[PDB]
A and B are shown apart, each in its own frame.
With several copies, the nearest count.
Chain A
Amino acid sequence: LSTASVLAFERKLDPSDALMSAGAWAQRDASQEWPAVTVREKSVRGTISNRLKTKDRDPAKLDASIQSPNLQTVDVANLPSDADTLKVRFTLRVLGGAGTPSACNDAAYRDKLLQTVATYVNDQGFAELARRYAHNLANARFLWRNRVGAEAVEVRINHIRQGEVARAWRFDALAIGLRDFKADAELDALAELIASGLSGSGHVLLEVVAFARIGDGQEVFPSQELILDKGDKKGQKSKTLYSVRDAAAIHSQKIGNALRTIDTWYPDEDGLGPIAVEPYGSVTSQGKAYRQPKQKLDFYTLLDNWVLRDEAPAVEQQHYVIANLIRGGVFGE
């Protein structure tokens, strides 16, 4: 048995964009008509503060290079000057049916894959992965730089069946730590909801709302567009920020990046934090790929040796591989 030349998994835990809107704390219980946070523009006269290449280090070139400064237009999102709380609201849905590929050549490989996944699920549920997902919703990973130095963060999650709230949660994103996945009764209840959703056993639709008290008029950090082509350096805008309709927002792929941060099993150190579940599991901020294929902890290696060759890995690497199948991916030769 060889691998399928076409392997493709559709993602579960599909989030939306998170709109940002602002108001005052202690009125966050009625935070339904809060005004949004608008992206504006401002000017930047900068200066030269780069590392020079030890050949352009003469004093005359430095003086003549700060004669003509660096003039830019950036985008900024701010709180209004009489509101100190940032409401960030999005909806997460938990699909379920997480072992079934969305494109597979070999019908024998798909049968062996589904036997492997159902053997996993009966030998141990989705409880570990859903409690780690429940943590990354219960603290505020999806508030990326909006979380740093805030003094009070509150997360409100609502499960939704129809036009009605099935069950409400109110977490505290600073007591629930960023590193140690400690257990809790409400985390176990919400984790059982997520693990019911991931196994194809119910309709799970969450509504994730987080409030962050930062200060009147302070700066918030919506996500930033990736633009390659800009103007001719005079009228160009060096920093664009994301916005769905007249409201500064965060992309859905980086909220999904925040939910995926589970991987405490990469062979360097769990003391350096969980990383995002990826194949070749790699961190863009670190610029470095943990979990190399020259070791044997890569997703391709573990999946091929656990489906084809029946070399079942450790239980933690099973959690890693099922986290990749929940993530999605377009694999193959």
Chain B
Amino acid sequence: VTDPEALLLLPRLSIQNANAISSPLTWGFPSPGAFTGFVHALQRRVGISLDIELDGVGIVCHRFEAQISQPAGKRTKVFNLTRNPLNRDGSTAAIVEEGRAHLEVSLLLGVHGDGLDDHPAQEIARQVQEQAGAMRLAGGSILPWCNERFPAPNAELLMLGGSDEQRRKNQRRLTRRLLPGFALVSREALLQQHLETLRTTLPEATTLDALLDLCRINFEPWQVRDKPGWLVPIPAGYNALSPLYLPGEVRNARDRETPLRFVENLFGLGEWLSPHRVAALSDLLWYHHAEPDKGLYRWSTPRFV
């Protein structure tokens, strides 16, 4: 939750077959926890050989397409699946379902490290995108060159550099590279605001956002409600459901050096915004913040409003 000394625009990334499930109660764009884990993976595998510190991530999502279908008379939708290989006797496999989608996202990476003065900006940008072109972002492959990968160069920009006119000018020159984009932010305080509004009957927060991504048809003495924005339900972190265990206690863990607790994820709210409506760009970035003695592990955009 440090303030960023720079911003890094991974400019245009086609994602091949990402995970469009995101939670047990959503299905659209993937969870922003995947983006936080991606930028932390870049912090691991190249972010220490350049003496930098990559924390924030700004989601943009230019173009979206999911592999769904509505089944011919039904009003809801289903997912398109894949054939898995056959069983041991070659009979058939038990089908689990996974939603798959195609993203075209752009990433804004906050940089904090002391190596911003030791290295030229283009070398930092080139090595970051050349590493990120061999990784994956929501369980989905990050696609190489296509018919129109002309904005291939990454760009780096220090937000502190220059005068106030210079900072805001270079900001609005960055926003010309987010052209059909729609940034995703967290709007937790609006969830508590509407809960304090309609908390006459039931102050359960599940009912609140379960009555916000909707059209609310009120009747004659029809006055359907007005949408304040593109409010959509998001998953917003994890809450524990078990006492934490030692690194050797839990059977079949991913390793034997980290403690494991069984958790439950923790639903939230946020809404998609154009990159003109935001004031600056340092307020737009996602950060992971955990309270480990309790079970509150979450991510948000701190210092947005």
Give the interface of A toward B (CB within 8 A): 5-6, 14, 16-17, 91, 93, 95, 103-107, 160, 162-163, 203, 205, 207, 225-232, 234-237, 240, 244-245, 251-253, 278, 280, 282-284, 286-289, 293, 332
**B135-151 near A? 1/0 per residue, CB < 8 Å:** 00000010111100100
Closest to A162 in B: B152
Q: A16-B16, A237-B72 are in contact. Are A227 and B78 (CB under 8 A)?
A: yes
B69 adjacent to A227 (CB under 8 Å): yes
| Beta-carbon contact of A229 and B80 below 8 Å | no
Of A104, A163, A225, A282, the residue contacting B69 (CB under 8 A) is A225
CB neighbours of A284 from chain B (8 A):
83, 85-86
In the bound complex, residues from chain B placing their C-beta under 8 Å from that of A230 are 71-72
Chain A neighbourhood of B130, CB < 8 A: 203
Kindly state the separation between the CA atoms of A119 and B88 in the bound complex, as whole angstroms.
30
| B90: Cβ under 8 A from any A Cβ | yes
Interface residues of B (CB under 8 A from A): 16-17, 65, 67, 69, 71-74, 78, 80-83, 85-90, 95, 102, 130, 134, 141, 143-146, 149, 152, 251-256
Inter-chain CA distance A230–B71, complex, in Å, is: 4
Residues of A within 8 A of B256 (CB): 105-107
Contact B71 A231, beta carbon cutoff 8 Å: yes
Do B143 and A91 touch across chains, with their CB atoms under 8 A apart?
yes
Partner of A5, one of B80, B88, B252: B252
The 5 A-B pairs with the shortest beta carbon distances in the complex, nearest first, are: A231-B72, A289-B90, A226-B81, A231-B73, A225-B80
Known: A227-B78, A284-B86, A293-B88. A207 touches B145 (CB 8 A): yes
Give Cα A93 to B256, complex, Å. 33
- Are B88 and A231 in contact (CB-based, < 8 A)? no
One of A16, A232, A235, A245 near B65 (C-beta < 8 A): A245
Query: In whole angstroms, what is the CA distance A49 to B271 when docked?
Result: 54
Contact B102 A205, beta carbon cutoff 8 Å: no
**Nearest residue, chain A, Cβ from B153:** A163
Q: Is the CB of B90 within 8 A of A95?
A: no
How far, in whole Å, are A17 and B90 apart by their CA atoms in the complex?
27
For residue B51, give the distance in angstroms from its CB to the closest CB of chain A.
Answer: 23
Q: A160 to B72, Cβ gap below 8 A? A: no
Contact of B73 with A240 in the complex, beta carbons under 8 Å = no
Taking a contact as CB atoms under 8 Å apart, the answer to whether A289 and B88 are in contact is: yes
Complex Cα gap A253–B145 (Å): 19
Return A224 CB to nearest CB of chain B, in Å: 10
User: Given contacts A6-B253, A160-B145, A245-B65, is CB(A229)–CB(B74) below 8 Å?
Assistant: yes
Measured CA separation A332–B251 after assembly (Å):
13
B82 touches A253 (CB 8 A): yes
CB <8 Å contact, B71 and A252: no
B170 to chain A, nearest CB (A): 25
Complex: how many Å from CA A17 to CA B102?
11
Task: Please give 9 more A-B residue pairs, beta carbons under 8 A apart, in addition to A6-B253, A17-B16, A225-B69.
Answer: A227-B81, A228-B78, A228-B95, A231-B74, A232-B72, A237-B72, A280-B88, A282-B85, A284-B85
Given A6-B252, A229-B78, A93–B144 Cβ distance below 8 Å?
A: yes
Closest chain B CB from A280 CB (angstroms): 5
- Chain A residues lying within 8 Å of B146, measured Cβ to Cβ, are 91
| Chain B, Cβ-Cβ closest to A293 | B88
Assembly CA distance A103 to B86 (angstroms): 14
Measured in the bound complex, the distance between the Cα atoms of B86 and A6 in whole Å is: 15
B87 CB, nearest partner CB in chain A, Å: 7
Q: Which of chain B's residues have a CB closer than 8 A to the CB of A278? A: 85
Report chain B residues within 8 Å CB of A293: 88
Does B141 contact A14, Cβ atoms closer than 8 Å? yes
**Chain B residues, Cβ within 8 Å of A332:** 252
Name the residue of chain A whose CB is nearest to the CB of B126. Answer: A162
Q: For B16, list chain A residues within 8 Å (CB).
A: 16-17, 252
Q: How far is the CA of A205 from the CA of B141 in the complex (A)?
A: 14
Given contacts A244-B102, A282-B90, A293-B88, contact A6 B145 (CB under 8 A): no
CB distance from A156 to the nearest CB of B (A): 15
Residues of B within 8 A of A240 (CB): 69, 80
Query: Within the complex, which residue of B17, B71, B152 is in contact with A236, where a contact is CB–CB below 8 Å?
Result: B71
Chain B residue at minimal CB-CB distance from A233 = B72
**Given contacts A107-B256, A160-B145, is CB(A93)–CB(B134) below 8 Å?**
yes
In the complex, how many angstroms separate the beta carbon of B101 from the nearest chain A beta carbon?
Answer: 11
Q: Please name all residues of chain A whose beta carbon is closer than 8 Å to the beta carbon of B78 when the two chains form the complex.
A: 227-229
Establish whether residues B73 and A232, one from each chain, have CB atoms under 8 Å apart when the complex forms: yes
Within 8 Å CB of A226, what residues of B? Answer: 80-83
Sampled A-B contacts (5; CB under 8 Å) = A227-B69, A227-B80, A234-B73, A251-B82, A252-B141
Check A16/B85 contact, CB under 8 A, given A227-B78, A244-B102: no
